[PDB]
TrEMBL record, chain A:
Key word Transmembrane present: yes
Swiss-Prot/TrEMBL keywords: Membrane, Transmembrane, Transmembrane helix
Transmembrane parts of this sequence: 26-44
Cellular component GO terms, alphabetical: mitochondrial membrane; respiratory chain complex I
GO biological process, any: photorespiration
Name recorded for this polypeptide: Transmembrane protein
From TrEMBL, chain C:
Keywords tagged on the record: Membrane, Transmembrane, Transmembrane helix
Taxonomy, superkingdom: Eukaryota
PANTHER family given in the database record: OS01G0750800 PROTEIN, UNNAMED PRODUCT
Official protein name in the record: (thale cress) hypothetical protein
Transmembrane segments: 33-51
From TrEMBL, chain D:
Protein's name according to its UniProt entry: ESSS subunit of NADH:ubiquinone oxidoreductase (Complex I) protein
Cellular component terms per the entry's GO annotation: mitochondrion; respiratory chain complex I
Region annotation (Disordered) ranges: 1-27
Lineage of origin: Eukaryota, Viridiplantae, Streptophyta, Embryophyta, Tracheophyta
Designated gene of the protein: MHK10.3
Domain of life: Eukaryota
Organism: Arabidopsis thaliana
Automatic annotation (TrEMBL), chain H:
Location within or outside the cell: Membrane; Mitochondrion membrane
Keywords, sorted A to Z: Electron transport, Membrane, Mitochondrion, NAD, Respiratory chain, Translocase, Transmembrane, Transmembrane helix, Transport, Ubiquinone
Biological process (GO), any one: ATP synthesis coupled electron transport
Gene Ontology CC: one annotated term: plastid
Catalyzed reaction equations: a ubiquinone + NADH + 5 H(+)(in) = a ubiquinol + NAD(+) + 4 H(+)(out)
Protein name in UniProt: NADH-ubiquinone oxidoreductase chain 4
Membrane topology: Multi-pass membrane protein
Protein's organism: Arabidopsis thaliana (Mouse-ear cress)
Record EC number: 7.1.1.2
Pfam families cross-referenced by the UniProt entry: Proton_antipo_M (PF00361)
InterPro entries from the UniProt entry: NADH_Q_OxRdtase_chainM/4, NADH_UbQ_OxRdtase, ND/Mrp_TM
Record flagged with keyword rRNA processing: no
């Protein structure tokens, strides 16, 4: 309204219409995609698939932990 | 919103904390009856004894009712 | 019009001060005697014996005698 | 129109931490507490970030894990 | 839209009317289709392996 | 200064500990208390190593875990009874 | 009706313990068809129809066994 | 026996730092306010860094006391005192050294009227509180604990907001002094038996069950006042409400920890047989305090009273954990103690933010604040959640571990203690909503300012610490388990 224009907030307050919201939205897109890259690499490193799939699956492209926990009487 | 009421009379206790047409104990009696319907229905289920009119014999599984497959001594 | 301090309300402040000064109102009435007896004495003793009984029921589950407590 | 016409906020509403911006071309004056506190904050992350990851692992859990591995090895190969 | 004495009613968008009629028609057909394929089965008239 | 590597401790119980009167050799009393703590932690890790085995057998064998891991479950459940400082004494 | 699928075949087929009954020898072809065909209902109608008939046969058999037992509860009452 | 240490960073230098700061600030004129502020803040910050270094060189495989250094009193060497820490006291030293600079920063704006007396009082408090936590002697522990009463009395009485501070300071002083007097009697009775007050020797001496029971009662009389346990907890709401903000932070975040610390350092290990006998008694008192004081909190109308009363229920849950006498219970009790000193301290900082501006503690005046102070509202909500023991926050780790340890001993006390999950949620969210949510009331408050740069920075280490313990408590539990394990095993040989 009137006084809310003098109030700072992280989410922008009411009816937030930043003028350059498109370049900021696209810059925000890139940050998430750059954040996602280490996450995906760590995920692929950490996944454990003790069973071979019935058909080839997209996670056989980057994951190398298929059919590994066969020796279970050795896990510590 | 519009204009918050500023008190003009000495505030009493139990004001920090301060269902219209039906009384307190009358509501408890009506709810008690409603829950007494489930009680009577459940008793009727015992009186029915559906377990005694089963139209098939209990499943029997092979290999001693799968004794080994269920974690028993092999 | 002036300052960030709250505009005091005499009725709200009176409610505030009467809360802080409740100990001047205690009178030792019948209701208080029942309330203090039930929730100051009877209920803690019930909780105490329930906790002891819980230990003791464990003792006879382990084939052990009843453990002594103060 | 909400996707094809840019917004109207030339500058965001309010000021971050409610401090008026300094005069154009000027830089904000740091209060006297900022520098010692931002140096303590920096040294805190460096000591804990490096020291905790550089001190040796001497937990009773890590020592017993290794100890328990050899005893289960030593009772398995031997009968 | 059409005005009848003060109160005006706006006609709905054409594709709203088309999709509504079409989706329910797809639904009515799928019901008639299914009822003729496995309707006797749920009535108990025949069994799936009958043949 | 401290040398690199895992901590080193005596394998055997202290010599000088009379279990009849534990409060007669105090230096041995303390050393027995530390030795028992270390011994108890070894059995705790034993059950955790045994627990990792049960976990992956369930994950690897699926519907066949009751027959295939019967032995591992028995071993884990025996190791956890009387483990650490839980609901069992000795 | 006699047991066909040995214990090893059921375990290798990873059959749920509740479906390791007399009709297990027909479930194995059915589930292999089901996985290969992404479990669509218009597929494997042949293996599905065969296996369902076996399971229908089993339940009727136990239903008839009770049909008998129920005819002897009254015999005891009619002679008591 | 000069048991001096070989480490470079030791406990004597840490104890000396704030003392040097106070001595220097003694002689600076009150016109040099900038210099006084800077010197006090720098002394406290260097003490914090020094304690962090002590963390870095900590050895987590030993159950012995670490960094042990001896300090001699008489050249006869009959009475000689030792300092040292283990996994049970290290983080409390760290917490003290961290909270003191916060206390200085909170009163930064008013420092032109507080004067050097305020900083000196807090720096003197720091020296005594660090020392109390570093003592390996019953007698020195006693003497240093009472020393804090003088500066705490001064802090409450001089810089309290209104004249109820008179009564509050009196009650605080008198209750605490009574408790410390019963501890003195037990220390002198122990000294009659053993001829010593050295803690390490006491941990190796045998007591009779009769005298174990009696000495335990004498320790309880002091510690239960410190904790505080019912019905000797009524001094707390007055003292913690009437104190200045930094005073409340010190009172709730550090001073409250002294009774539970005394239970872990003296009563529980030194008298194992009596501790078992009084376990139903402690369980009953804690359970009553949790249920009853949580319900009183619900009916409080003062902002600082709700936070003060919440502290009582959290501390009695700590006592259930430590008297469970297992790894989870004692481990959880120490983590909740540390978490409470961050969460309740942050909460007292939120209320002080509101009070410094509007000068009222009554909930009825506030409300609607999210529309004028969204930054404060977000920070206030986070510490509101941490006070409800929300999973992911530091307080949930200690809370659940204590309930685990209690369940393995007595399922009834763990059940009554778990009722605080429902009650603690009720008063925390009701408080937050009545202050932040709703509509503004311009007839009471119409002029508003959100947090400034100093207040936001003050809240940062509290958010980081709360998150850091809530998601990865392993960095703390690893350094504790060896000391915790030997505390549990103390007095048994099977």
């Amino acid at each position: 309204g009137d006084f809310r224009a003098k109030v700072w907030s992280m989410t922008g307050g009411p009816n937030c219409r930043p003028k350059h919201w498109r370049r900021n939205t696209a810059i925000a897109m890139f940050g998430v995609f750059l954040v996602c890259i280490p996450i995906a690499k760590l995920s692929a490193k950490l996944e454990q698939r003790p069973h071979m799939p019935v058909r080839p699956i997209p996670s056989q492209i980057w994951c190398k932990n298929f059919g590994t926990k066969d020796d279970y009487e050795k896990e510590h | 919103v519009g204009k918050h009421i500023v008190p003009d009379k000495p505030l009493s206790v139990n004001d920090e904390l301060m269902a219209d047409t039906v009384g307190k104990y009358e509501a408890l009696a009506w709810l008690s009856g409603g829950l007494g319907f489930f009680v009577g229905l459940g008793l009727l289920a015992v009186l029915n004894d559906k377990a005694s009119k089963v139209p098939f014999t209990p499943r029997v599984y092979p290999y001693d009712n799968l004794r080994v497959e269920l974690g028993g001594e092999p | 019009g002036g300052g960030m301090e709250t505009n005091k309300n005499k009725f709200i402040e009176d409610w505030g001060s009467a809360r802080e000064n409740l100990e001047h109102n205690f009178r030792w009435t019948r209701r208080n005697f029942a309330l203090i007896g039930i929730f100051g004495i009877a209920l803690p003793i019930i909780v105490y014996k329930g906790i002891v009984k819980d230990f003791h029921m464990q003792d006879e589950d382990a084939g052990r005698p009843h453990r002594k407590f103060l | 129109s909400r996707w094809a016409t840019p917004g109207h906020e030339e500058r965001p509403k309010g000021y971050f931490m409610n401090r008026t911006p300094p005069a154009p071309g000027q830089s904000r004056k740091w209060e006297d507490w900022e520098l010692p506190c931002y140096i303590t904050s920096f040294l805190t992350i460096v000591i804990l970030g490096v020291g905790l990851n550089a001190k040796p692992d001497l937990s009773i859990e890590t020592w017993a894990h290794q100890k328990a591995l050899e005893r289960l090895e030593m009772e398995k190969l031997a009968t | 839209g059409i005005t009848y004495k003060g109160v005006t009613v706006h006609t709905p968008k054409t594709w709203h009317t088309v999709t509504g009629k079409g989706l329910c028609a797809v639904m009515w057909f799928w019901i008639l289709y299914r009822a003729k394929q496995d309707g006797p089965v749920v009535m108990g008239w025949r069994h799936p392996w009958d043949g | 200064g401290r040398k690199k590597g895992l901590p080193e401790f005596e394998e055997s119980a202290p010599d000088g500990f009379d279990p009849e009167n534990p409060y007669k050799d105090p230096v041995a009393m303390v050393e027995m208390r530390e030795h028992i703590v270390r011994e108890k932690w070894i059995q705790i890790e034993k059950a955790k190593i045994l627990r990792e085995k049960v976990k992956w057998c369930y994950r690897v064998e699926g519907v066949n875990h009751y027959q295939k891991c019967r032995h591992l479950v028995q071993q884990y459940l025996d190791s956890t009874r009387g483990v650490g400082w839980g609901k069992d004494h000795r | 009706k006699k047991m066909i699928a040995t214990q090893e075949e059921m375990s290798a087929a990873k059959i749920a313990l509740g479906s390791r009954d007399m009709c297990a020898h027909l479930l194995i072809p059915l589930n292999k068809c089901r996985q290969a065909e992404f479990y669509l209902p218009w597929k494997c109608e042949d293996e599905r129809h065969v296996y369902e008939k076996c399971e229908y046969e089993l339940v009727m058999e136990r239903m008839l066994a009770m049909k008998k037992i129920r005819e002897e509860e009254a015999l005891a009452k009619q002679n008591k | 026996l000069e048991h001096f240490c070989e480490c470079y960073f030791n406990l004597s230098g840490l104890i000396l730092c704030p003392v040097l700061g106070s001595i220097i600030l003694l002689f600076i004129p009150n016109s040099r306010i900038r210099l006084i502020r800077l010197i006090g803040l720098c002394a406290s910050l260097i003490t914090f860094l020094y304690s962090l270094v002590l963390w870095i060189q900590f050895d987590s495989s030993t159950a012995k006391f670490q960094f042990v250094e001896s300090l001699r009193w008489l050249p006869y060497e009959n009475i000689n005192f030792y300092l040292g820490i283990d996994g049970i006291s290290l983080f409390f030293v760290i917490l003290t050294t961290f909270l003191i600079p916060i206390c200085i920063l909170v009163g930064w704006s008013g420092m032109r009227s507080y004067g050097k007396e305020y900083i000196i009082a807090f720096l003197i408090c720091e020296f005594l509180m660090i020392a109390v936590f570093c003592m390996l002697d019953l007698l020195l522990f006693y003497v240093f604990f009472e020393s804090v009463l003088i500066p705490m009395f001064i802090i409450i009485g001089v810089w309290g907001s209104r004249q109820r501070k008179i009564k509050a300071a009196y009650q605080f002083f008198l209750y605490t002094l009574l408790g410390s007097l019963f501890m003195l009697l037990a220390i002198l009775l122990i000294l009659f038996q053993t001829g010593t007050t050295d803690l390490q020797i006491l941990l190796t001496t045998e007591f009779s069950e009769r005298r174990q029971i009696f000495l335990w009662i004498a320790f309880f009389a002091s510690f239960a006042v410190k904790v505080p346990m019912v019905p000797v907890h009524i001094w707390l709401p007055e003292a913690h409400v009437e104190a200045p903000t930094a005073g409340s932070v010190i009172l709730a975040g550090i001073l409250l920890k002294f009774g539970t610390y005394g239970f872990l350092r003296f009563s529980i290990p030194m008298f194992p047989e009596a501790t078992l006998c009084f376990t139903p008694f402690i369980y009953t008192l804690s359970a009553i305090a949790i249920i009853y004081t949580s319900l009183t909190t619900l009916r409080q109308i003062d902002l600082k009273k709700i936070i003060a009363y919440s502290s009582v229920a959290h501390m009695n849950l700590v006592t259930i954990g430590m008297f469970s006498l297992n790894i989870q219970g004692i481990g959880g009790s120490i983590l909740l103690m540390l978490s409470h000193g961050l969460v309740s301290s942050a909460l007292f900082l939120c209320v002080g933010v509101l009070y410094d501006r509007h000068k009222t503690r009554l909930v009825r005046y506030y409300g609607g604040l999210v529309s004028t102070m969204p930054n404060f509202s977000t920070i206030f909500f986070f510490f509101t959640l941490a006070n409800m023991s929300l999973p992911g926050t530091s307080s949930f780790i200690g809370e659940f571990l204590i309930l685990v340890g209690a369940f393995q001993r007595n399922s009834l006390v763990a059940t009554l203690a778990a009722l605080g999950m429902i009650l603690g949620a009720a008063y925390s969210l009701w408080l937050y909503n009545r202050v932040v949510s709703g509509n503004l009331k311009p007839d009471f408050l119409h002029k508003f300012s959100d947090l400034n740069g100093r207040e936001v920075f003050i809240f940062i280490p509290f958010l980081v610490g709360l998150v850091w313990m809530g998601v990865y408590p392993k960095v703390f539990l690893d350094c504790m388990h060896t000391s915790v394990s030997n505390l549990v095993q103390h007095g048994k040989f099977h």
